[PDB]
Write a protein that binds this ligand. Structure first.
Ligand SMILES: CCc1c(C(=O)N(C)Cc2cccc(C(N)=O)c2)[nH]c(C)c1C(C)=O
Ligand code: NA
Length: 127
């Protein structure tokens, strides 16, 4: 069994921009979600080999996780906040697509998503 390569986190050809919204996503949104008691299943790419989920990457073709998001934020991978917000949304949706409603992993995802959306409501205006 094999995992795919992880999502891209370095590309010197991709133009980059530091923005107050992106700083907010790292400083406030990611940091807050990362420390949450249910963050641990989302802090790295799903290891389908270790977890014995050989169909995972048959079902999930755009994998995403907070470890990848943290790296993208910390090493300034993004141009805008919407790119990052999309990554969070993809992580949550993948979980809801792959797992059954009311699986523990889904309850965890929903808790994080609720917190995520609350923080996104305070996304600062672009300076
Ligand atoms: C339920 C499996 C799962 C987890 C999960 O439980 N994880 C990823 C922690 C873990 C366990 C076992 C091993 C490891 C390691 N990385 O070594 C990590 N997270 C997600 C998004 C899912 C699914 C299928 O949606
Ligand atoms: Na499902």
């Amino acid at each position: 069994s094999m995992n795919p390569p992880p999502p891209e986190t370095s590309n010197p050809n991709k133009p980059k921009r530091q923005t107050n919204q992106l700083q907010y996503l790292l400083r406030v949104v990611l940091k807050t979600l990362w420390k949450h008691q249910f963050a641990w299943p989302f802090q790295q790419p799903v290891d389908a080999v270790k977890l014995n989920l050989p169909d995972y990457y048959k079902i999930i073709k755009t994998p995403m996780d907070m470890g990848t998001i943290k790296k993208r934020l910390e090493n300034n991978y993004y141009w805008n906040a919407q790119e990052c917000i999309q990554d969070f949304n993809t992580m949550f949706t993948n979980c809801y697509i792959y797992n059954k409603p009311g699986d523990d992993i889904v309850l965890m995802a929903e808790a994080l998503e609720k917190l995520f959306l609350q923080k996104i409501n305070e996304l600062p205006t672009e300076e």
